[PDB]
Design an enzyme around this catalytic site. Structure first.
Site, PDB file in Angstrom:
ATOM      1  CB  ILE B  26      -1.029   0.126   1.089  1.00 12.98           C
ATOM      2  CG1 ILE B  26      -0.016  -0.296   2.486  1.00 12.98           C
ATOM      3  CG2 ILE B  26      -2.174  -0.871   0.873  1.00 12.98           C
ATOM      4  CD1 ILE B  26      -1.142   0.046   3.719  1.00 12.98           C
ATOM      5  CD  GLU B  28       8.299   1.113  -3.894  1.00  6.56           C
ATOM      6  OE1 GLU B  28       7.565   0.685  -4.766  1.00  6.56           O
ATOM      7  OE2 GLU B  28       9.848   0.847  -4.145  1.00  6.56           O
ATOM      8  N   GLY B  29       8.248   4.234  -0.716  1.00  5.09           N
ATOM      9  CA  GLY B  29       9.185   5.609  -0.728  1.00  5.09           C
ATOM     10  C   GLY B  29      10.434   5.329  -0.653  1.00  5.09           C
ATOM     11  CB  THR B  30      13.304   7.312  -1.013  1.00  3.49           C
ATOM     12  OG1 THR B  30      12.473   8.440  -1.494  1.00  3.49           O
ATOM     13  CG2 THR B  30      14.649   7.283  -1.826  1.00  3.49           C
ATOM     14  CG  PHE B  31      14.471   7.021   3.237  1.00  2.00           C
ATOM     15  CD1 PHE B  31      14.039   8.312   3.223  1.00  2.00           C
ATOM     16  CD2 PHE B  31      15.681   6.574   2.817  1.00  2.00           C
ATOM     17  CE1 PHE B  31      14.805   9.276   2.594  1.00  2.00           C
ATOM     18  CE2 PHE B  31      16.487   7.558   2.209  1.00  2.00           C
ATOM     19  CZ  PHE B  31      16.091   8.943   2.318  1.00  2.00           C
ATOM     20  CB  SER B  32       9.687   2.864   4.653  1.00  5.55           C
ATOM     21  OG  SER B  32       8.564   3.344   4.260  1.00  5.55           O
ATOM     22  CB  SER B  33       7.958  -0.750   1.154  1.00  2.88           C
ATOM     23  OG  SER B  33       8.680  -0.717   0.103  1.00  2.88           O
ATOM     24  CG  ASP B 139       7.943  14.292   4.791  1.00  2.00           C
ATOM     25  OD1 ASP B 139       8.261  15.133   3.914  1.00  2.00           O
ATOM     26  OD2 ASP B 139       8.059  13.128   4.702  1.00  2.00           O
TER      27      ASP B 139
HETATM   28  N1  LIG Z   1      -0.996   3.235   9.661  1.00  2.28           N
HETATM   29  C1  LIG Z   1      -1.434   3.472   8.265  1.00  2.28           C
HETATM   30  N2  LIG Z   1      -2.507   2.929   7.866  1.00  2.28           N
HETATM   31  C2  LIG Z   1      -2.794   2.661   6.680  1.00  2.28           C
HETATM   32  N3  LIG Z   1      -1.932   3.316   5.514  1.00  2.28           N
HETATM   33  C3  LIG Z   1      -0.862   3.657   5.925  1.00  2.28           C
HETATM   34  C4  LIG Z   1      -0.493   3.730   7.471  1.00  2.28           C
HETATM   35  N4  LIG Z   1       0.867   4.021   7.386  1.00  2.28           N
HETATM   36  C5  LIG Z   1       1.483   4.389   6.080  1.00  2.28           C
HETATM   37  N5  LIG Z   1       0.109   4.199   5.296  1.00  2.28           N
HETATM   38  C6  LIG Z   1       0.205   4.268   3.764  1.00  2.28           C
HETATM   39  O1  LIG Z   1       1.625   3.933   3.346  1.00  2.28           O
HETATM   40  C7  LIG Z   1       2.539   5.271   3.034  1.00  2.28           C
HETATM   41  C8  LIG Z   1       3.898   5.166   3.339  1.00  2.28           C
HETATM   42  O2  LIG Z   1       3.907   5.227   4.803  1.00  2.28           O
HETATM   43  P1  LIG Z   1       4.843   6.212   5.351  1.00  2.28           P
HETATM   44  O3  LIG Z   1       5.006   6.291   6.901  1.00  2.28           O
HETATM   45  O4  LIG Z   1       4.640   7.977   4.928  1.00  2.28           O
HETATM   46  O5  LIG Z   1       6.459   6.127   4.875  1.00  2.28           O
HETATM   47  P2  LIG Z   1       7.239   6.485   3.476  1.00  2.28           P
HETATM   48  O6  LIG Z   1       6.640   7.898   3.145  1.00  2.28           O
HETATM   49  O7  LIG Z   1       8.693   6.687   4.122  1.00  2.28           O
HETATM   50  O8  LIG Z   1       6.688   5.356   2.558  1.00  2.28           O
HETATM   51  C9  LIG Z   1       1.465   6.330   3.607  1.00  2.28           C
HETATM   52  O9  LIG Z   1       1.755   7.575   2.814  1.00  2.28           O
HETATM   53  C10 LIG Z   1       0.110   5.749   3.453  1.00  2.28           C
HETATM   54  O10 LIG Z   1      -0.583   5.829   2.257  1.00  2.28           O
HETATM   55 MG   LIG Z   2       5.476   9.196   4.270  1.00  3.16          MG
END
Ligand SMILES: Nc1ncnc2c1ncn2[C@@H]1O[C@H](COP(=O)(O)OP(=O)(O)O)[C@@H](O)[C@H]1O
Ligand SMILES: [Mg+2]
Ligand SMILES: [Zn+2]
Lengths: 90, 315
Positions: B26, B28-33, B139
């Protein structure tokens, strides 16, 4: 000296290098473009070194050493403060 | 595809197999999925869970910091909490309750005016909470503020970029080095003292960010400031808030800005109305916007001040 248009930022205490932006055109606010458009329309922290490929860097001995070390105690300390409330299977 | 990623996740963190039915990716970012998973709670119900898998090139301090922000500040006041965390060497997975949410783009031009008020109220509750603990999010933007329109629930997430105020109650945040001293965010949501590399950066930077969100909401435009680097975001800001005004405010924080084309500050009501209960948006709306987009970080409105703004009378 500088070709226009430009933006220049410098620190009044010289604790920073001057940095610049030069564009062809300054941003202009475009009210005509349609909603929802803008009106203006790696490296390893553990090994402290740049890499060309992640999957192979993760297998390198430098990284693999770090990965197995004590350096994650800081994480485990927090983890041993949380309550596990899921059902776990064998 | 995603199937291969899930399998590699299980293989990377064997304990997840005993607990989670990992169903989808659900995020994907530079630093995590981030994955959608289902689990069984000891107390009875099955619960949907978001699993954030952090990239293994991440420093353990950085990892612990995000986790600590979630543990200490989260779980309350529209700030996401954590259920548990699982590690296997350099692979850490943070497990959170899953909040089904809209795409910001998607609901942008279909929200009622009341839903805008409510959205902004609830964002300020979350910023109030994290700022009490001395957390600078760094952020704040719609992808990190999750919004469920149907249930009217909200959650600020993603502390992967957080820093501490000098008196932060989150002990570990003191080890995150200042970007200013020597992980960047999205130029378009970054306050001018951030964009200009000001060494002192406070919780006011998050309040600017909520000001950028409010601006998208009032204008119907997102992303409002489309920029791929910091100074481009700054040139765009000067177009909105005036270059003289920005040059003046930047001096009060030790930065000298030279701009070759002088541009004037825009009236915020006109700007938003030209761009966009939407027939009678009160002056207070535009007044609050002006306080959030205060170019001076010292006078910029605080999150607990915002909640007391007459814009939110009486909620
Ligand atoms: N607790 C959560 N419940 C539902 N969706 C989530 C949750 N945490 C993250 N997501 C989905 O995953 C994405 C990435 O999470 P995030 O913590 O912003 O990490 P990153 O930006 O480093 O990928 C979010 O922008 C959101 O759409
Ligand atoms: Mg994020
Ligand atoms: Zn490494």
């Amino acid at each position: 000296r500088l070709k226009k248009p430009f933006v220049k930022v410098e620190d009044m205490s010289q604790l920073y290098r001057p940095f610049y932006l030069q564009l062809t055109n300054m941003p202009f606010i475009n009210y005509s473009i349609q909603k929802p458009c803008s009106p203006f329309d790696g490296y390893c922290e553990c090994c402290l070194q740049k890499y060309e490929d992640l999957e192979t860097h993760l297998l390198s001995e430098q990284h693999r050493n770090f990965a197995q070390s004590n350096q994650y105690q800081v994480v485990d300390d927090i983890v041993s403060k949380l309550v596990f409330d899921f059902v776990e299977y064998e | 595809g995603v199937k291969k990623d899930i399998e590699k996740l299980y293989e990377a963190v064997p304990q997840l197999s005993n607990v989670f039915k990992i169903e989808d990716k659900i995020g994907e970012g530079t630093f995590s999925s981030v994955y959608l998973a289902t689990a069984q709670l000891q107390v009875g119900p099955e619960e949907k869970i978001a699993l954030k898998h952090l990239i293994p090139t991440s420093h353990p301090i950085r990892i612990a910091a995000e986790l600590q922000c979630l543990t200490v500040a989260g779980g309350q006041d529209n700030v996401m909490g954590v259920k548990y965390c699982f590690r296997k060497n350099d692979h850490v997975v943070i497990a959170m309750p899953y909040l089904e949410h809209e795409s910001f783009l998607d609901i942008l031009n279909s929200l009622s005016f009341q839903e805008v008020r409510e959205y902004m109220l609830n964002l300020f509750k979350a910023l109030k909470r994290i700022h009490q603990f001395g957390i600078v999010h760094r952020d704040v933007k719609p992808s990190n503020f999750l919004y469920n329109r149907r249930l009217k629930k909200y959650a600020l997430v993603d502390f992967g970029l957080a820093q501490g105020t000098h008196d932060t109650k989150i002990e570990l945040l003191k080890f995150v080095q200042s970007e200013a001293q020597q992980r960047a965010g999205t130029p378009g949501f970054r306050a001018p003292e951030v964009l200009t590399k000001c060494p002192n950066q406070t919780t006011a930077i998050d309040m600017w960010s909520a000001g950028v969100i409010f601006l998208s909401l009032l204008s119907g435009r997102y992303p409002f400031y489309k920029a791929s680097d910091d100074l481009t975001a700054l040139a765009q800001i000067m177009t909105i808030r005036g270059s003289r005004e920005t040059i003046q405010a930047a001096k009060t924080f030790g930065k000298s800005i030279l701009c070759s084309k002088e541009v004037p500050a825009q009236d915020l009501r006109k700007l938003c109305e030209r761009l966009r209960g939407w027939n009678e948006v009160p002056d207070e709306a535009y007044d609050l916007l002006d306080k959030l987009l205060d170019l001076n970080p010292a006078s910029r409105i605080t999150a607990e001040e915002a909640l007391l703004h007459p814009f939110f009378k009486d909620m």
